[PDB]
Design a protein around this ligand. Structure first.
Ligand SMILES: CCCCCCCCCCCCCCCCCC(=O)OC[C@H](COP(=O)([O-])OCC(O)COP(=O)([O-])OC[C@@H](COC(=O)CCCCCCCCCCCCCCCCC)OC(=O)CCCCCCCCCCCCCCCCC)OC(=O)CCCCCCCCCCCCCCCCC
Ligand SMILES: CCCCCCCCCCCCCCCCCC(=O)OC[C@H](COP(=O)([O-])OCC[N+](C)(C)C)OC(=O)CCCCCCCCCCCCCCCCC
Lengths: 70, 37
């Protein structure tokens, strides 16, 4: 039920003390469309600027944490 | 000395009054390693 329509107290809703939660579930479901588009670290940023990219190019080898600077 | 030879170079008594200013140096038992996971 719409949060906007319940503001005037003229359609179906006079007192709705949790009307400000009405669009949380729809907004959460719509955000689930990018569940697989943004999976893992590499899909949320430019990975070559992050530390894990360096470990992969070194053959999945551990590097000192400041390797991106030297 | 007393029937014994201990060969040493010529001692310099001026080395006693050598101005050696103490410098700060702190040891941290528990610090940083090389690599971390
Ligand atoms: C050029 C192109 C051509 C142009 C011409 C053609 C185009 C013409 C129009 C075409 C259609 C347009 C659609 C809209 C008009 C429709 C008219 C109508 O009657 O519809 C009624 C229609 C009927 O209801 P319904 O069909 O039953 O259900 C509707 C929905 O399903 C869901 O309904 P709902 O009511 O359940 O949704 C509720 C939801 C609706 O979603 C929203 O609108 C998002 C609202 C978020 C903003 C809230 C702002 C709060 C106040 C801020 C004040 C300052 C603002 C400064 C802004 C600066 C920005 C940086 O809002 C909320 O959730 C409210 C609660 C928010 C949580 C609490 C926040 C407040 C407290 C925190 C305060 C913090 C500060 C405190 C201190 C302040 C300092 C003193 O209801 C609608 O409102 C429809 C809107 C749905 C979205 C449509 C989007 C379509 C895509 C278009 C692109 C996006 C455009 C909108 C972007 C807005 C900016 C984000
Ligand atoms: C630059 C920013 C400031 C702009 C000016 C100030 C505008 C107010 C601030 C913006 C608020 C926008 C976010 C909130 C949106 C409203 C949310 C809401 O609850 O509204 C539901 C309400 C519903 O009210 P209701 O009375 O119908 O039902 C509510 C009943 N109770 C309260 C019991 C639940 O609708 C509104 O839009 C009210 C807000 C109106 C604000 C209009 C301000 C201007 C008034 C008209 C101009 C008059 C000029 C003189 C006219 C001369 C004669 C012609």
């Amino acid at each position: 039920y719409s949060f906007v329509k319940s503001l005037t107290h003229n359609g179906f809703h006079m007192l709705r003390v949790f009307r400000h939660f009405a669009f949380v579930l729809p907004a959460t479901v719509l955000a689930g469309l990018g569940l697989f588009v943004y999976w893992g670290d590499d899909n949320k940023c430019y990975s070559p600027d992050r530390f894990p990219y360096l470990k992969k190019r070194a053959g999945d080898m551990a590097l000192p944490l400041n390797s991106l600077n030297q | 000395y007393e029937d014994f030879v201990f060969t040493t170079p010529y001692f310099q008594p001026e080395s006693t009054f050598k101005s050696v200013p103490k410098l700060f140096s702190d040891i941290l038992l528990g610090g940083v390693e090389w690599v971390y996971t």
